[PDB]
């Protein structure tokens, strides 16, 4: 839940100006304190200048080796109870 969904990252020339112009957020600090959650439709397009860059900060897996350890614990639990 922390990291499995990718986090879109923008390297903007001016963060405050970009936020104010796009999302109308004049007081971004107060927006952060207010728990202000931006709303995006799903279908968005970016218009950056030459310098600015946008990327997804994506990870191959958020839980790592949890699957194998959980499987091992399942096997051990079945073994202790010796259930068919």
């Amino acid at each position: 839940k922390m990291h499995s969904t990718p986090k879109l990252k923008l390297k903007l020339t001016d963060v405050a100006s970009f936020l104010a112009h796009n999302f109308g957020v004049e007081d971004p600090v107060k927006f952060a304190k207010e728990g202000g959650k931006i709303n995006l439709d799903g279908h968005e397009i970016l218009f950056l200048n030459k310098d600015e860059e946008a990327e997804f900060v994506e990870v191959k897996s958020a839980i790592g080796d949890a699957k194998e350890l959980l499987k091992l614990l399942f096997y051990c639990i079945v073994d202790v109870s010796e259930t068919p």
């Binding site: 903007l12 279908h43 970016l46 218009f47 200048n49």
Partner: protein
């Protein structure tokens, strides 16, 4: 008064007023007009301060800035006004919600 503002930006008593009005008509933003005026003013240095930059006569040596330095400074002024004009026009980056109809 826009003409006074240009004649203060672009230094005065070089051009007459009607061509300043033409400059302003050529571009709505006064700074673009001032940059245009400065680049056309840089041509005036061929007459106001000729190629002869230094001379001595008798007991008087006068060394003035060569035409290259003056025209370079005029181009610096023109570029500065152009940049200031673009700064006036400039807008930041944007991201918008694209969409399309579908059944």
């Amino acid at each position: 008064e826009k003409l006074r503002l240009l004649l203060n930006d672009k230094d005065k008593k070089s051009f007459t007023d009607e061509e300043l009005n033409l400059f302003l008509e050529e571009a709505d933003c006064i700074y673009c007009a001032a940059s245009q005026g400065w680049i056309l003013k840089s041509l005036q240095y061929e007459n106001t301060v000729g190629e002869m930059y230094e001379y001595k006569v008798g007991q008087e040596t006068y060394k003035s800035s060569s035409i290259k330095d003056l025209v370079s400074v005029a181009y610096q002024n023109a570029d500065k006004f152009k940049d200031m004009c673009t700064n006036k026009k400039e807008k930041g980056s944007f991201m918008l919600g694209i969409s399309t109809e579908f059944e």
